Amino acid sequence: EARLRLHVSAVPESLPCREQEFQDIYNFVESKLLDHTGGCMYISGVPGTGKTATVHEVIRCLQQAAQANDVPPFQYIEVNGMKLTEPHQVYVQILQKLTGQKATANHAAELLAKQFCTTVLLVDELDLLWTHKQDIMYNLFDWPTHKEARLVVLAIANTMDLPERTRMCFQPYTYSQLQQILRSRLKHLKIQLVARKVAALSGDARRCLDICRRATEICEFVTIAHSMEAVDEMFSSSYITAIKNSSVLEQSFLRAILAEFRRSGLEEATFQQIYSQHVALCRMEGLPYPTMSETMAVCSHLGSCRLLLVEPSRNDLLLRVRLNVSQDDVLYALKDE
Amino acid sequence: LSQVQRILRERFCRQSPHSNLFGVQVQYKHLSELLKRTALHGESNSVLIIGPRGSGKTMLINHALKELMEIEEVSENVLQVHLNGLLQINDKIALKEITRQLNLENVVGDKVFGSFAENLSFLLEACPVIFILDEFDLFAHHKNQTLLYNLFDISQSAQTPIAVIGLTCRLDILELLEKRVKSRFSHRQIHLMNSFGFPQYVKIFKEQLSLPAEVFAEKWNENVQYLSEDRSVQEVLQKHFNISKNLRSLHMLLMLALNRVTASHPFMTAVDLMEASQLCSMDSKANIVHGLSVLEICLIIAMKHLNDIYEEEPFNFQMVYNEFQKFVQRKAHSVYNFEKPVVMKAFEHLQQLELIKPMEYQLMKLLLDNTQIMNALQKYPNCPTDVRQWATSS
Amino acid sequence: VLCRESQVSILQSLFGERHHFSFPSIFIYGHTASGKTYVTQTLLKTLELPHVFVNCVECFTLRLLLEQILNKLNTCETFNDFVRLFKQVTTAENLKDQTVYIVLDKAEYLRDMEANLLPGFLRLQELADRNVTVLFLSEIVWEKFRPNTGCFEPFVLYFPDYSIGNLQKILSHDHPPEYSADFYAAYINILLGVFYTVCRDLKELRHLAVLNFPKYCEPVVKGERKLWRNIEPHLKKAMQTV
Ligand SMILES: Nc1ncnc2c1ncn2[C@@H]1O[C@H](COP(=O)(O)OP(=O)(O)OP(=O)(O)O)[C@@H](O)[C@H]1O
Ligand SMILES: Nc1ncnc2c1ncn2[C@@H]1O[C@H](COP(=O)(O)OP(=O)(O)OP(=O)(O)O)[C@@H](O)[C@H]1O
Ligand SMILES: Nc1ncnc2c1ncn2[C@@H]1O[C@H](COP(=O)(O)OP(=O)(O)OP(=O)(O)O)[C@@H](O)[C@H]1O
Ligand SMILES: [K+]
Ligand SMILES: [Mg+2]
Ligand SMILES: [Mg+2]
């Protein structure tokens, strides 16, 4: 249970290492809350930057403050866009969390309009609420600006351009910031040459905890060598691996592709042209003739694993073939030996 | 007796749950490891088994899942859910399929929950579950990806024991996931299956044909080991190896040669496998050409002359008709001369066979390779000396 | 059945014993008149193996194709999801332990229907694990069926075109109604001697064999061998027209 207790600490965690962002959001809600007014704040960032976690923290703190009467009471509501099949179910959620309970999306939206013509509403990943007419976004952002509406809106998504089609952004995590979170809870061990090794990344936090959690799995069955192995089992590109393990005729077919490309110089060629090249190579390697039924199988083996991008098999000799891997990568996979 | 057949048929055709695991020793450790961690402890993980098709995945996960549930605590406390991208084409179908495999059909339908996640969470809360997603590629293609996102979202932040194990053949899988789902996927837990060495292939050949401990089996295995080394079986197995590097293709080869074994032919021979190999090596489109009428052939030779004259430009019936008329013109008498509607019937039959493709007033291009044509003509049973001379005119 | 004897030995031994397992999928190709389904139905009828036979051009949709296959086993069916469900739920002392056969004729039309339907059928054995064999037969080469993500590759069995000799032996000696079979033989040998180079379809040759038979033997009843001279211009009248 020594280095095994370090397993238990990776999957979720607390408390935040985003110190400055937290304060900004707290003061935003506190400002709007103290005044008995509404507002909206859009939060950008990379998927791993601690946006929803920080918000949840700010909420728990504001509820504590609401118990001592430091800040006005009370209610809070959260809904996730990716948790719904059909965007319009949002109106049901919001209403169901408030009074009035169940109703259709049409009747709910009408009711929310009535209520809004204090409450904190978190809409996490409203990128999913995009619709042709975008009525729901227009409503969520219009509601807090009504006189009779006291509503504070916190909108999370991954892109800065969303509101362009009262704002904040979470930058990706740096060398030191990631290094911080890992040792931040290693307190079982107060092994730390690794925490900085894994810490060079782009830019998610989940990568760190999941990577190092795998490193411990390597150790048992932690040094820097264990983490290099951990990363090489994850971020390592599988394409070059597959080309090395591909069969004989599969490689000759790639050589055929590269031959046709070096002739034309384009990124597309037809199975017919590639076929002529493949015949030439099989002739020069002492191989048997590449029966077109075989070569079609091969070309599908390489298109099933996405080494190739191939037109549907119905087109027969007119298949147009693109490489899903850069020519330099293939030459390196074939020529390494 | 036929007891041989009953065995190899469940091994070759159906996929034998128990067999020898070749070269997966590392990958099995990582999968079985993770599986203990989610089943025995309260940990939640997600992993992808990624290989070419026909090798690896489904047997690995099947073998791993079996050994896992042989633990008494596991069999009682662990539920497993098997999903497939072919069967469930919609995340709503999948939701109701999870509800079905979890024996949670007692919800029952009276509460339609406000959100997809709320319905999924309500199912798990009614205690680990191992989610197997086969043909993971297709689950990535569902609209906004609700099933993947919320399974990973539940795998990470919900602390409900769950195991999300995908199977895919795509080296491109990770690029098919949204930024959000890619993050929540326990990052790039990846098992790769791929291929082996030729000596390992031959050892596999002899191991799959041999019979287990079940004097009849002992005599059988001695003869297999004799086959393992032969200049014939080996030069055939290599030819298949240079294409396959796959145990499923091998299984087919062993199966076809297994029909050759009867009560009058007790055990396989070199010829049994050579014949079985010949059936697989046939060129399908060459076989189809062999059965055309001499009219259809002459049309293809007309099309051949048209691609060699106009430089691979498409053509229509008219110009084919003209070039074909130039063929019968040689003799004043009518031998191959037929009425235009009939020639077009045969022409339309070539299209009906998808030996010509469109893009008469429609332009089309020939789907045959010239070496297929000249080889077929030499192998054609009745081919008249006149059409052969015409074929080489170009 | 004649001249297919070799294909019967391959396709019969593949069936093996009925309680065994067979290929998850088999794909037969060949021409219209190759005799594919005549051989398939006989083998399924004679033994007699439980089976179903369905025409893919008749059923264009899923509802129709899948409801036929389910009904014919002895049932509202939308998506292939519920076929494995309700095919797996179809088991009894009749089907319990045995190989079940599903023959999809003109599978070439499956390509145009539903993306997941042809793959689901190729693997149907392990999807329901019910000991099934799906038999595809079409005039289109297997190379054109393959999808992007792939599939379980079936066994590709080739039913070769009938030769001119295979045609006569099948076409002639099996209905010599009013005469010696040698007389009807010389008749067919002349029939093919004209129409073969144009029409190789056994189906159509049987028509013309029936059509022009009376005129061929008319000089016999009227008291007038070597009748090739008699009907050849008449046969050539029908050749370039029919
Ligand atoms: N500073 C941190 N300390 C501890 N854990 C962190 C930190 N930053 C991120 N995490 C990890 O990230 C998760 C919190 O989610 P996060 O706030 O990144 O969601 P999100 O950014 O809204 O999700 P997405 O951006 O993908 O929509 C936690 O479960 C934790 O494992
Ligand atoms: N390393 C191996 N150990 C055991 N059997 C193997 C191995 N590699 C290939 N096989 C055989 O090849 C077949 C592969 O089946 P499986 O479904 O497990 O993977 P797959 O065919 O790639 O799956 P998919 O349906 O995604 O293509 C099995 O019948 C199995 O017996
Ligand atoms: N050996 C034979 N003896 C007698 N008749 C035969 C023979 N072979 C084929 N036929 C003829 O062909 C018919 C059988 O159809 P066949 O088996 O050619 O269908 P199919 O090949 O499955 O059709 P398609 O290929 O167009 O789907 C019989 O009814 C008979 O008219
Ligand atoms: K059987
Ligand atoms: Mg979020
Ligand atoms: Mg599989």
Numbering used by the authors:
A (entry chain A): 490 to 606, 614 to 661, 674 to 698, 705 to 735, 746 to 861
B (entry chain C): 17 to 142, 152 to 239, 244 to 388, 398 to 432
C (entry chain E): 8 to 81, 95 to 244, 251 to 268
From the publication, what sentences describe this entry?
The first step in genome replication, the binding of the Origin Recognition Complex (ORC) at origins of DNA replication, triggers a series of highly coordinated steps leading to the assembly of pre-replicative complexes (pre-RCs) in a process that involves CDC6 binding to ORC. ORC and CDC6 then function as an ATP-dependent assembler that first recruits a ring-shaped MCM2-7 hexamer with bound Cdt1 to DNA, and then loads a second MCM2-7 hexamer in a head-to-head orientation, whereby this double hexamer is topologically linked to double-stranded DNA (reviewed in [O'Donnell et al., 2013; Siddiqui et al., 2013; Bell and Labib, 2016]). Here, we report the structure of human ORC in a functionally active, ATP-hydrolysis ready state, providing insight into ATP-dependent protein loading as well as DNA and CDC6 binding. The structure of HsORC reveals a remarkable similarity between two very different ATPases: the replication initiator ORC-CDC6 ATPase and the replication fork DNA polymerase clamp loader.
To facilitate structural studies of HsORC, we separated the particle into two lobes, one consisting of an N-terminally truncated ORC1, full-length ORC4 and a C-terminally truncated ORC5. Since ORC1/4/5 is comprised of the active ATPase subunits, the inclusion of ATP was critical to maintain its integrity during purification and crystallization. The structure of the HsORC motor module was solved by molecular replacement using the DmORC4, DmORC5-AAA+ domain and DmORC1-WHD of the DmORC complex as a search model. The overall architecture of the HsORC motor module resembles a cashew nut. Each ORC subunit is comprised of three domains – the RecA-fold, the α-helical lid and the α-helical winged-helix domain (WHD), although the WHD domain was truncated in ORC5. The RecA-fold domain and the lid together constitute the well-known AAA+ domain. The three RecA domains form a semicircle with ATP nucleotides wedged between them in a classic AAA+ oligomerization arrangement (see below). The HsORC motor module crystallized with ATP, and the nucleotides can be clearly seen in difference electron-density maps between the subunit interface of ORC1/ORC4 and between the interface ORC4/ORC5, as well as on the surface of ORC5. Despite the ATPase function of the HsORC motor module, the electron density indicates that ATP hydrolysis had not occurred. We therefore conclude that in the context of the motor module, only the ORC1/4 interface is a functional ATPase. In contrast, the human ORC is active as an ATPase and the RecA-fold and lid domains of HsORC1 form a classic ATPase site rotated almost 80° from the position in DmORC.
